[PDB]
């Protein structure tokens, strides 16, 4: 797997956040999906078949704002 980590500025509470992990871990290359609730970091781990640019359009279509914190 590679890895990506992104600042998801709309993360504050708990009940909004699993709408990320539920969707991402349904994609046929995602290996793991972590999140941090005070620092707004989201840390996703995946094989192949998608770009950080494609992920930014998916997670912005989840109704967030995200900027790619690292590609690692």
């Amino acid at each position: 797997a590679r890895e990506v980590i992104l600042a998801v500025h709309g993360m504050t509470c708990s009940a909004c956040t699993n709408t990320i992990n539920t969707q991402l871990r349904a994609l046929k290359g995602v290996t793991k999906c972590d999140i941090s609730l005070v620092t707004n970091e989201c840390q996703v781990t995946y094989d192949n078949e998608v770009t950080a640019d494609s992920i930014k359009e998916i997670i912005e279509d989840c109704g967030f704002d995200c900027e790619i914190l690292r590609d690692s």
Binding site: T12, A15, C16, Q23, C62, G63
Partner: protein, 73 residues
Amino acid sequence: MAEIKHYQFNVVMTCSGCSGAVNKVLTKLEPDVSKIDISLEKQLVDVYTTLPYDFILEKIKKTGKEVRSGKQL
């Protein structure tokens, strides 16, 4: 073509950070959507637009929240 239609969706929504996410997704469509208005207690979302109905259902499906109903008016 270009005549405004009215749509209303009932959607499962816990937080003000749920309606504030729906608002952030639908903001991208204001060039062809003329009004957006959410009622959290009524669990519903009102839309007025020239965009095709199934494209809004699919932007809701990418927002990821579960849908109780959708209709045109």
